[PDB]
Amino acid sequence: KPASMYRDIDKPAYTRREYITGIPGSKIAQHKMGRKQKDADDYPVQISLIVEETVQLRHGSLEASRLSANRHLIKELGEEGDYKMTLRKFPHQVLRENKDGMRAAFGKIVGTAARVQAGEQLFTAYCNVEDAEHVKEAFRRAYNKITPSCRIKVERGEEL
Amino acid sequence: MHALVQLRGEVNMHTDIQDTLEMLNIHHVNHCTLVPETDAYRGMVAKVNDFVAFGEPSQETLETVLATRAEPLEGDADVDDEWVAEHTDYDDISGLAFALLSEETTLREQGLSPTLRLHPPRGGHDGVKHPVKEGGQLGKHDTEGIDDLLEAMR
Amino acid sequence: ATGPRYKVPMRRRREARTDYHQRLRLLKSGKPRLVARKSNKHVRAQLVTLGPNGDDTLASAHSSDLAEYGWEAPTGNMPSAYLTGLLAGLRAQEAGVEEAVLDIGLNSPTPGSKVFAIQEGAIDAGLDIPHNDDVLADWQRTRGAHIAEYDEQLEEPLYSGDFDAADLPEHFDELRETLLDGDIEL
Amino acid sequence: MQMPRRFNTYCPHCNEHQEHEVEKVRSGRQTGMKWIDRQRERNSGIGNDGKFSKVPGGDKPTKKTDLKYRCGECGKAHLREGWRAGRLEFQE
Amino acid sequence: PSSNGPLEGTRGKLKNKPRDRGTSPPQRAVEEFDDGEKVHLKIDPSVPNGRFHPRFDGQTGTVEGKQGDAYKVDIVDGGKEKTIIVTAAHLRRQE
RNA sequence: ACAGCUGGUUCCAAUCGAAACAUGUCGAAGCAUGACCUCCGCCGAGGUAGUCUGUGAGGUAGAGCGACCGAUUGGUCCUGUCAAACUCCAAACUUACAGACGCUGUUUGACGCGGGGAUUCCGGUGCGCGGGGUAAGCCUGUGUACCAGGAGGGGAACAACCCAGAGAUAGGUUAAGGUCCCCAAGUGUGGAUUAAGUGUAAUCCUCUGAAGGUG
RNA sequence: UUGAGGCGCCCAAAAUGAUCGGGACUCAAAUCCACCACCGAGACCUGUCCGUACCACUCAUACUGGUAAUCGAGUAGAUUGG
RNA sequence: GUUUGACUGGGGCGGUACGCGCUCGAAAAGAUAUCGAGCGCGCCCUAUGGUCAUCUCAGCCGGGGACCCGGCGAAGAGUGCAAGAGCAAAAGAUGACUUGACAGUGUUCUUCCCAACGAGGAACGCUGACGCGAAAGCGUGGUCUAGCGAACCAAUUAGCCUGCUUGAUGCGGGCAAUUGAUGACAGAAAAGCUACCCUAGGGAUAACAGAGUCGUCACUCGCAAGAGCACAUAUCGACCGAGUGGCUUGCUACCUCGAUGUCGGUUCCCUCCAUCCUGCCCGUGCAGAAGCGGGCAAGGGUGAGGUUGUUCGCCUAUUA
RNA sequence: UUAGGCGGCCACAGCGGUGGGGUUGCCUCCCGUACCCAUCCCGAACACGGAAGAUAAGCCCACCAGCGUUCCAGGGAGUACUGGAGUGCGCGAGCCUCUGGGAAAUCCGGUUCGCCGCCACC
């Protein structure tokens, strides 16, 4: 199914699992990547991927963007490199589909999405000065698999 | 004391806004009333903000407007210095105009119509789609700004 | 105490001084309350009406201001209870109060107890309080016969200070008589 | 529900409380001499008999209480508004 | 509404804020109002007896006599005049 | 013959001027009773479409959750997110009554009461807020103004977009919008950008143009 | 070297004849920022008349005089004069 | 001879949103729709009702998943049943007593906001008689909101009225109220077929065509994991993401039901490009030859046949 | 109020903690069961009678802010949201300008360890 069916935030907040049953599990493997034992403050450079429009990103897109981002970080910095990336948004909004015509139209549950407001941080990676252009490329590959246009904002980078 | 001028029509206008203008004795487009500055009266012009043109007139301008557009409570009779003298509590137009500005009396209280039915603006106005800060003619005006409109509507 | 959701009871309930459930029922009559309190050494009896900023006391009597009329005996017993109640009811009649309802507070409604004796006193003073005759003590226990007959089981005196040996419940009769008198400085 | 055979309650006849006995109203037998019985024999002819051609309807899932409150002293009975009860048993 | 009962949509108005939980103070439950007095109708969630239909919560009626201990309060519902039987516990004085 | 169904029902003018909704109905192509329109008689001084202030009602927006509740990360306290059927918080705003100003009524009698006659109960559109649906010139709510039943001006044409609510006639000035021609009015002025005929397209089924990219 | 903004370009495929209404337009007849003067309704102002309503006079709803900034659009329908 | 209901993104099948209650929807007063989301009621209880007395619960901790003692503990316990709400010297627990779950008659709100409408319901009185309590007081059933039924007829309760000139007897007629069901729940006693059909109408509503939409279908683009002996990018290319078209399908119900002739085929004309061939090109995993992929490009061409009504599709031999 | 009784508002009053205070006065603890009354067992409690002793609890008095709370300042923030208007912008989702209102979290610093009424009383 296309994202055009679920990208907008025009529907009510539908998250209460105590009233919603049959919700498919998140396709997302892990939110904490890299060296999850080290601190975020132990890094001189902090670069975040910021979403420019207010959208709803599906779990499949969140995973597809996370995968192609971390896979580049694993390729360039190794499986145990000195970095740590975090996916701070979780897929809370439950999605329906009406799959009988328009009679009894309330659809059956088909998935989960993440309501991300404009200007919000979707991803945040912490790295060392030398590995800065690798993480800027991990995000260039990641923003290609979500719905909005994005910003690659450096929060702790006076080294340029 | 502010001078209100309805610059936008009644069609599509909210009923509660329409009725506020009727309470301020202003029933047609280009009509003008002299409203005092109270809390009660300010709540009224704020609700009319987008369909009107207001601000404080200058003594010189109020006089010009009163001479040309003021009417008695009934009749065609021109309001000149002699009319004022024989019917009002003042000596001339200036004496009445000073009282209206200092909020000592109202046009109704003196036997004059609460409406100064003006002429369309000569050279036209700055527009009825935008406020004054955006280059239009709606909302609050400068004392020099309201004069330009009141004088053009002689 | 714990957080924002915590409910702290009303002040006189934390203090465990007022039974607010019984108070509501007491106030439903519209009549002034005959507040009957008892301490270890003393006994209090008030006539309370409802006011705008709190309760109003129009007439009261404490067992300590009983000695002002001639008492020379202890103040936390049955004869003292009636008299403190009679003295409260008499001051009440002078205040323009005619009827009342018995507020025993947190005390137990035990038959023939001191709070019911305070009530018997006010009834005899001229006040119209809804009562029950067989829940009150028999006239001799009110007089103080139980105490005099305990001094009969002597060997050692009951009283420390010198009032008298075998005890006089006749002092009660003499005091009821002194208060029943039309003169007396109330 | 369970209900006591005898209990104290108001007798609208004696104007005072007495010990009443409760009994389930036993249906009285019909005489066949009422007006409705005469109209049945009269109005019934060839073909459909209209109202007399109908059959008694169904039932409600639970019936109401159909009791008789017999007074212990004067011996006169009274009726009360009943309530829905699936089964009504008596105690003693 | 999914049902036309009296307590429909009254989760908010007939519930106390956590700190206002438990038995209410008696002083207001025995308050004496005189005729002609303007009073504020608001149900106390802690008091079960002597309420009114929740649709009238927020009205400011006029006391026009009493029926037993409860008061007969005259209100105007939209344009229709109504008489509400209510106890003192759910009434507050105007001004 | 009966029909709750289609069609038709013939002269002029003046005043007021809707409902397309609620309850009941073998009811949903119909009725009745209310809302609402109109007419008559009565009563007799107040009324309340606006605003301000005062005394009350409220849990939507937002927010937040070691404040309940329930979702929902990782690490050896710290660290990562949420809620139509959550709330330690909390508006704008709507709403009861009262006072004040305004407006209005006391020969145009308001507010109100009683009676006669209805029509009406297929609605639609814009805007705001919605709920459902991939969506719809979709379906179904709500507040409001409009079309319906609203001319005239503008928008190429065009029920509801803009101006504007309109007796006849006549002179004048403007509104929306427009001033190169068609076509009334500028080939106006100061400055800058664009080289694609981008553009000369407020709103829109109607006018597209996206992610991504551009020494 | 890097950051930000403006206008444009790529991305960009549809069936009888292409289009901003058409012509045609390039330091504009486009776009943005200011400004100047005009054109342009039945609106607004103004002369006369008409209808309706109310006031004065009147038997009159006959004349005469007056007031309307706060009267003048209307389907179904109620009312009334011809 | 008749009946064989209504609702409904047409109708039917399914379902009941056909009488009721709670939360959300509902936009912080009131009102508010959908075959809207979550889910309930058509009883049960002689105590699980009523009053009074005595008392404080879940959970955790320490001492000897039973029991005993202490401490912490405003409420997470319990309160018949949905849901929301109320409650702690109680509305919960225990104990005892009691029958007010009483008769009569009302005021008021609700049912039905506003705003008319029955049954039903509730709040709040009074009259009479009662229960408990010391008493104020509490008890008009269950802490609150679901647990319900007209006329006619019958039975039933107590007293009384009444039946044609008249008395007696029988058997009737009535005033007041209780019970008996109509759940299609403001109440008819009620099954189907019609392609043999008929009529009244409707584009108020379906099939076909158009129109909107584009989930489906077709085509493309972004990123490029991956494989391709090494090499992403000769070639193939996932995930995810952005779109174009209006050929398929689906949706909607705007247009026509006083008729816009069906599918397939045929014949004859014009067109689109997302190009199969032909022309000119680029790359190659391009020696050549034969290819593979891509670009510009719509001038011309794209044919004959076997099964099948077929469109589609399968098959044959020819063909640039 | 040299310690009391009944209250109102019902945390600004709560949780926790420190210091002080009582010869015939007050409140307590305290002493003690013949009686009224009392425990499904216990004069523990309830009830009754009383002062040998005490200020250690409670209570009354003064004070501390760590926690919870009330209010205020400054910052967050005129941000979020929003009633009215717009031939303003944007393919759109949405945004912006003008006008009238205007949070919440959190941070820092103050406040708050109850206020008030009637009565009685060295």
Ligand SMILES: [Cl-]
């Ligand atoms: Cl006491």
Ligand SMILES: [Cl-]
């Ligand atoms: Cl039975």
Ligand SMILES: [Cl-]
């Ligand atoms: Cl009510």
Ligand SMILES: [Cl-]
């Ligand atoms: Cl109009």
Ligand SMILES: [Cl-]
């Ligand atoms: Cl061109």
Ligand SMILES: [Cl-]
């Ligand atoms: Cl005529």
Ligand SMILES: [K+]
């Ligand atoms: K047709």
Ligand SMILES: [Mg+2]
């Ligand atoms: Mg005039």
Ligand SMILES: [Mg+2]
């Ligand atoms: Mg001009």
Ligand SMILES: [Mg+2]
């Ligand atoms: Mg303009």
Ligand SMILES: [Mg+2]
């Ligand atoms: Mg709510």
Ligand SMILES: [Mg+2]
């Ligand atoms: Mg006519």
Ligand SMILES: [Mg+2]
């Ligand atoms: Mg005429």
Ligand SMILES: [Mg+2]
């Ligand atoms: Mg929110």
Ligand SMILES: [Mg+2]
């Ligand atoms: Mg019409």
Ligand SMILES: [Mg+2]
């Ligand atoms: Mg020209």
